[model samples]
Target: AGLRKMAQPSGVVEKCIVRVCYGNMALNGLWLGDTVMCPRHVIASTIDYDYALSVLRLHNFSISSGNVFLGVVGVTMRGALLQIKVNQNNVHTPKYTYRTVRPGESFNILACYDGAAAGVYGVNMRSNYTIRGSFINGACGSPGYNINNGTVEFCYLHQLELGSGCHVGSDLDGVMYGGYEDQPTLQVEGASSLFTENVLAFLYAALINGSTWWLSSSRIAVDRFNEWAVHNGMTTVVNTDCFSILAAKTGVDVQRLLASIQSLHKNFGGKQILGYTSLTDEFTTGEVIRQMYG
Candidate 1:
């Protein structure tokens, strides 16, 4: 074969480092020299083991032919993987680099290996290992990210006001109204979804619109809270007490109730509130009174 021919003294070339750069054919059997030094980008045409062997064989020939030395440098990945073999022979194994990702942490492999930060592929290698869960962009409120076949497992919301059509634990296809139609929506497989902090923020919007689904669903807790308020002679209360009592009754943390309420609101609030409003828009006034007292 052509490779066997290269082992001959007659086919041997003068000793020197051959610099391979980006070109029409960055690597070929003929370009093999005493030292094959690739100073920059050189595309490996194939991913199979044969292509890897061809490159190493030529370098081996340079070393075998004489006292002159041979070396190889600067290789990069066409696609990402955990491991790549250097040659057909089992003797040569490339050294591995490692990185650790802690819980609630993420890393971008491509950016760290950029040519500017490191010399090149010889000095820089690229790959990822042991990735779990999906990477989501943006946050709960902002637009432009969604989880598919998954739910927004958890979120921290500073601003409580609903953006567009926000659903706590529902799929993207779930009914939505408001500017959220154009904003980013989170879609998830749902058991329950909780929105924390700013719990009452959306209530104002519901009230202004005369939607009592949220109020109606909370009616039991609302009644209990009002009774407690009357007994204690307290007024000027928000849904905070209602939620607290509801949490006590349900044997759940008040914070966790936010998720339950959000999920319930998404599933049933719209229609039920619409029905309640049909009777009288003043229902919001009554609820506000109860909230004030309770």
Candidate 2:
């Protein structure tokens, strides 16, 4: 055996940044995908385990759906499963930091840890753990910042019993934001996606505006908010900036958005209102309406 062979290769890195964290806020995992020219170009495919290892070996981050894309069939699915142990009686909380997903960019994320208090947190210093640049631009519907323009459809978020944090947000303290669609064509339609049994912080999945339960906070304190911000830590920042930061943006692309929805449906077998895992049948678009509104 004079000559030696090389080892195998693996993983996908698209134009998005996949970072996981929890204790001590380390870069536990990392995967970047580049799909500029080719849309279907999977920078990483089935070879996710190695990349997953890279996630653990390099950083102390959490893992879930290193690659989450939706199918036209509308099934729910999550990409990866992150297993972590406290090794010691106490381990630093791992907090994952994903690349800044701007408007027009969509990402499907499923965050989980051991037991209760195990869930994802979108640590955007602006709003609560809500995704940025989405339509619900603020905790309350401010005058100019009143907008709901993100497309978070059909993605089911469940089993999160944490008393705080949210998949989306309305008030600076809500769980998840919804309904306001900045995209004229492809607005948000959270049809079959379910949100229940979570001790969500402020609001739990709501379609907000100036006149809806969706609209909880008030925009009249806009100026006062800025004064408070300056009094606290921020300087030269206007309340508008704070509002913009709080309000989820309105530019996530249709592909990434829809893909996440599909993954949730197929992977998790999806639960319904109140996180009921037993109900796993995908309803027709029509049925979705009856079950949801009714």
Candidate 3:
């Protein structure tokens, strides 16, 4: 058989009476998808606080039916309508914290990712690529080792740049060491066909946390995988920084990262992964399906 599919029904109703509530306490209301709909003819008994009904997360819960009646015994009647708001708590945080390095210091940086074991790693020095240091641990290992473990195999180095300082004196002891502190910025080039955002973010985090050469307040600007490979002319540029020209690597806990993503799918509960959730009326839903699962 080519495929098996189930057909869904579609219809509309002019008049309908629907009510949903959760919990035995009778206070909590029901949540119907992303939005909610309420009826106009709503009636209550006694003007009391116990009978006051409130809808949460639904601000525009307006009823435009024929007639409605509302009464409570001890309820605080601010108005016919009230707005409820709540703030969501943030849970995600950065995995690592980088340190700061001043000028005139011999600090080396290394950018390592999965499968950078037997490559010619070094800094892009004056249009010429020079290989730096050697790997520490047993070259390449598990993805977890590549991500968490800090061995020698992950460090690469660029040529040093001795920046200038402020003029404090005359002749011999003229300059002071407090000028524009120089730091290395990385320019990464990937040789792979597709450098997904998942891989990029994980790689960036690994480089920041695994190496000691990077300045605490440094930002890395990298090109797309295809672009980096093509623009660099020759050689596969895994990852390079502006401060020092170096590149190096290990592996990643693919299961760990994807686990979090799968959890997110439960919270969002849709066909789309992350931001590219399916498609809308502007684009055909089939297009989104192909983009994601296809």
Candidate 4:
């Protein structure tokens, strides 16, 4: 005898709702075959955030955002299914702060009650990308280490530009502050930080102008960072004003950074282990996912 198979219902109104809320939940990496659905057979369309919240809570998940919720079809999303929005109607963008899903994480939901086209929302964290910039722009509250316990290697950050907001002689443009844009309340702290093989525009402290690095007046900003790096025995070099280069670890070339990252992943034990998430579902690797154009 064969094992029983089940059929699912069809229709945009009869769609599924996926919930991703948890510490171990990888918010960035999502894949197909992973799904979720609403319990009650509500209206033909429209997502219920309260209902969604209940489901997430049931699974030890949490939501932290300003004023946002899951998107609803026809009303919130236009013709597209499984697309989530915070406030499709208004200017209030809801912040959903959940742990980002890294390479070695997973979240699974059920495919209940027949042909219901289920949907999912997840995140994938991969370390194969490069973001090049300089502290000359100033940190502006952006952490020297943006994400806690995260490591960025073979990447180079150069062309430090500063905005006028921080101090005199700062960059002409305003500085951008960094933090948990979503969860403003979460305290930032963690070790395991590594920013190897990259060049900075110039060391902030070494700057004659107070604008310096980090773009903040706090003592803990770039000025202190220079001291820290030198104290820790990293090479410390001062450079010419216009064409100067901030020194860092050896062997980091800006041009071949991304290619090197891909090579490293293949060479190491990362054939299937180093992707931000599943290759197919989360991100389109080469498809202009977006560039670091300011």
On TM-score, the candidate that comes out on top is 1
- Please give the lDDT score at residue 276 for candidate 2: 31
lDDT of 3 by residue, 117-180 (tens): 1222211111122112333322211100011222212111111122221111000111112221
Query: Residue by residue across 86-186, what tens digits does model 4's lDDT show?
Result: 22342221221123222211121122121222321222221221122222211211111112223211001111122221111110111111211112133
lDDT per residue (tens digit) for residues 1-294 in model 1: 000000112111111112232223221111221212221113323245235434543232221112222344323321211011122222221121222222112222110110111110100001111111211221111111111123211111101123222222111222122112212244322121111122332243244444444443323343444444344322212445534433343344433333334345346444543333211111222233334343
Which structure is stronger by lDDT: 1 or 4?
A: 1
Give TM per candidate: 0.20, 0.17, 0.13, 0.17
lDDT of each: 0.24, 0.23, 0.22, 0.22
Clashes of each: 7, 69, 32, 23
lDDT of 4 at 230: 52
Deviating ranges (above 4 Å) for candidate 4: 1-68, 74-87, 93-200, 203-294
Task: Estimate the TM-score for candidate 1.
Answer: 0.20
TM value for model 3: 0.13
Model 3 error, position 207 (Å):
2.2
